Symmetry: C2
Subunit: 339 residues, 2 copies
């Protein structure tokens, strides 16, 4: 009988001299042609990408012509690809995207939530009675969905539904990019009420490598993919925002590194100039582990660019300080990433 | 005297989405009776684990044994707060402030630092009413008020009470060694979130320590009495141990007066069932609170299988639904069959 191997320990969290907690996980690094550069752990069992694949889901917004018809630039494209903090800049831009399609917050079907970022949440609490759908981290993606529908005269009502034309189109796009089979059996409902399709990490990484390089893509999809990847790297605040790893990681080497977090410990990334796509998951779903793992994986490709490498290693290995500012331990990606 | 077998910890908690397991947690559980006999276990219960806040009731023994709690007229709410990782609600803050003032001190005596509530609803209330939190809002402020009170009652200068060789920390090591039978020293010590020592020890020893506090077995009369007072106070005033929305408080409302529980940072739980002579400790390998919560409920449930209403209420913590922002059920967080 075959079985699945136990995932290796990818991240340790120390206190004093001891490992206090440990995370296991898996990483796939795939080039534009589909060759596996590097991997750790189980890259074949299907994993939910959650928000990490928002740039794939943003392809309808661009390919439909809607982004151009509505005058969207890199900030709107980045927001369409974002799990944003719900800061005022994000909420205003989502509202503007909807308004250009003749719609408003009432068209959003994602629901509302308070910021998961503590400083932004404090700001929101002090200025709002309750968040609205615009504050949802997925509001730019859903504004992008609504814009793709309205530009094409598709009724956006029910755009979250499995057989709404928008979800039909997103399945076709993601199957083409990743080569995975996306069906009801491997589908769940995402935090924002749209389908999320579990697929192998190997396929997810391959899909990001294709977006990053154009390999295997028809001309319009290759061009739209470049636009999205470049918009995210050009306006990284709009992908995440203040205090956030995705934003800071895309400020290390401006215009060269694409990253995107997903809920439950997922990260996707790409390095266009190296032809590389990356996907990963921390087995237990911890964000702190996925962040350390994506920085340590990226660092493998910048070892001779000392300033970039040092900045990535500062996310791969990070100090923890207590409320008095005393160093108590570290969160560190393990040696499997440098071997 | 060869070395024990190494172990990979089993999957104790699954998090599903749709038809699939989305995330998984591994961990370990020790259940020990008052005599030190191992009653049930899963995973590695012998490698040292930091208990973090889960052992606050052990650290509260100086407050009671010194005579300070009685000298200051404290009741169960103050004892519970001394044992608490509280939410920083107004009642917790006011009670820590009055424990300090009854000892002739104030917020400036606290050496733990300040933080915003880890509970989101309380955070929102704090943000709307405060420019910044103070040390009284720290989840450990009742414990640290207890420390300061223990010092002041005995005319021990509380300044520097976080330090490794302050008399209070010397006393805490002696208490915790007696209760747990573990060796506590600098090599197995770290600094806690509140700046005091935290000592790694095997889950087996931590569970035994809670079984001893719960039963009195192996303890001298004053320590057995003080331990009863602390465990009873937590069960009597469980809001003061944690607060609104919190697992420790809700778990202590299932079977009033019968189940003691306490969370610790990084996925630790300790528990006791005094009437059954049982102490419990556990850790999620990755540190996730959601896993530790499911594990403590599934472990407790094994002791109440013939008490259907208590069992059902515990099972609702062992397997909990997850809903998205629209209220749609997306999956569940469930303790696995290793608990059966
Ligand atoms: Cl969700
Ligand atoms: Cl294509
Ligand atoms: Cl800490
Ligand atoms: Cl004793
Ligand atoms: Zn979403
Ligand atoms: Zn503490």
């Amino acid at each position: 009988d075959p079985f699945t191997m136990t995932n290796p320990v990818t991240v340790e969290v120390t206190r004093g001299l001891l490992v206090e907690s440990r995370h296991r996980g898996a990483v796939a690094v795939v080039d534009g042609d589909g060759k596996l550069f590097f991997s750790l752990g189980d890259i074949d069992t299907a994993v939910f990408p959650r928000s990490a694949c928002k740039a794939m889901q943003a392809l309808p917004l661009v390919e439909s012509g809607a982004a151009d018809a509505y005058g969207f630039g890199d900030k709107e494209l980045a927001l369409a690809c974002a799990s944003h903090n719900g800061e005022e800049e994000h909420v205003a831009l989502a509202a503007s995207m909807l308004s250009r399609a003749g719609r408003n917050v009432e068209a959003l079907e994602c629901g509302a939530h308070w910021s998961m970022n503590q400083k932004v949440l404090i700001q929101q609490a002090r200025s709002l009675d309750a968040p609205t759908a615009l504050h949802n981290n997925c509001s730019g993606k859903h504004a992008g969905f609504i814009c793709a529908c309205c530009h094409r005269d598709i009724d956006p009502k029910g755009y979250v539904g499995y057989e709404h034309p928008l979800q039909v189109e997103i399945r076709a796009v993601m199957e083409r990019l990743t080569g995975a089979v996306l069906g009801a059996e491997s589908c769940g409902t995402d935090g924002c009420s749209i389908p999320t399709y579990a697929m192998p990490l190997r396929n997810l990484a391959h899909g990001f490598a294709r977006m990053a390089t154009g390999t295997g893509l028809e001309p319009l999809r290759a061009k739209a993919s470049r636009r999205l990847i470049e918009a995210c790297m050009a306006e990284p605040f709009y992908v995440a925002g203040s205090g956030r790893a995705c934003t800071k990681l895309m400020q290390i080497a401006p215009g060269r590194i694409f990253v995107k977090t997903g809920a439950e410990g997922v990260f996707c990334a790409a390095i266009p100039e190296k032809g590389i796509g990356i996907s990963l998951k921390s087995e237990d779903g911890a964000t702190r582990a996925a962040e350390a793992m994506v920085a340590a994986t990226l660092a493998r490709f910048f070892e001779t660019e000392e300033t970039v490498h040092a900045a990535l290693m500062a996310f791969a290995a990070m100090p923890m300080r207590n409320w008095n500012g005393i160093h108590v331990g570290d969160i560190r990606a393990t040696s499997v990433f440098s071997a």
